[PDB]
Amino acid sequence: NLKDKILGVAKELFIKNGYNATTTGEIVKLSESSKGNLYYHFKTKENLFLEILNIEESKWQEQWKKEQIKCKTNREKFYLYNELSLTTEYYYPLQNAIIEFYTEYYKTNSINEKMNKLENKYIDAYHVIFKEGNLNGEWSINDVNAVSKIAANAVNGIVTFTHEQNINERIKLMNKFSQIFLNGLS
């Protein structure tokens, strides 16, 4: 594909290097396509990137729907979502590239904008889990949005800043966390 092989080499470059480490010269070299092509659906580098973020956030949110049935209760969905977070091939592997990118465009205006419709997909998962959990007496949480946001970020932290120690310790810690967290809501 054309408008898609671009996004493909893109996602990869952004992961295998950094947000800046990969420049348009590169995309149009490994994806092969006149600089112009990169101008339709992608009105900028921050578009090509803020684009992939949406795909990714989606591919994951979907993989999660197709894997969350293994969780009978929400207290179980909480643990599961967090544990899966550690192993997907989606979204979470671009957290570094995002940190970077948000430190080099957070000045522009449309930065804190797209980072809204996207931030809502991101904390959705927890939102559903914590809300559906009040309807299920599992716990009682007045400020759901707060907690979703907290949990989403805490988790992303555990996932991102420990991506160096053996996968089994990572999942071990993440569970102790999910454990401590939920025990804090009741």
Ligand X SMILES: Nc1ccc2cc3ccc(N)cc3nc2c1
Q: Which residues bind a second copy (CB under 8 A)?
A: 18, 21, 96-97, 99-100, 102-104, 106, 111-112, 115-116, 119, 143, 146-147, 149-150, 152-158, 160-164, 172-173, 176-177, 179-186
Please name the residues in contact with 71: beta carbons below 8 A apart, sequence gap of 6 or more: 77, 79, 80
What is the smallest separation between the CB atom of 184 and ligand X, expressed in angstroms?
26
Exactly one of 62, 102, 169, 175 binds ligand ET (CB under 6 A); that residue is 102
Residue 112's binding partner among ligand ET, a second copy, ligand X, none (Cβ under 5 to 8 angstroms by kind) is a second copy
The window from 7-15, 87-95, 125-133, 161-169 that contacts ligand X (CB under 6 A) reads 87-95
Residue indicated by tokens 């430190």: 103
C-alpha–C-alpha distance, residues 120 and 167, integer Å: 28
Residue indicated by tokens 């729907």: 65
Contact in structure between 36 and 27 (CB atoms under 8 Å): no
99 binds ligand ET (CB under 6 A): yes
Give the Cβ contact number of residue 171 at 10 Å: 15
The window from 21-29, 86-94, 133-141, 164-172 that contacts ligand X (CB under 6 A) reads 86-94
Contact in structure between 160 and 181 (CB atoms under 8 Å): no
Nearer to ligand ET, 7 or 50 (CB): 50
Residue 60's binding partner among ligand X, ligand ET, a second copy, none (Cβ under 5 to 8 angstroms by kind) is ligand X
Q: Site residues (CB under 6 A) for ligand X?
A: 53, 56-57, 60, 88-89, 92, 98, 118
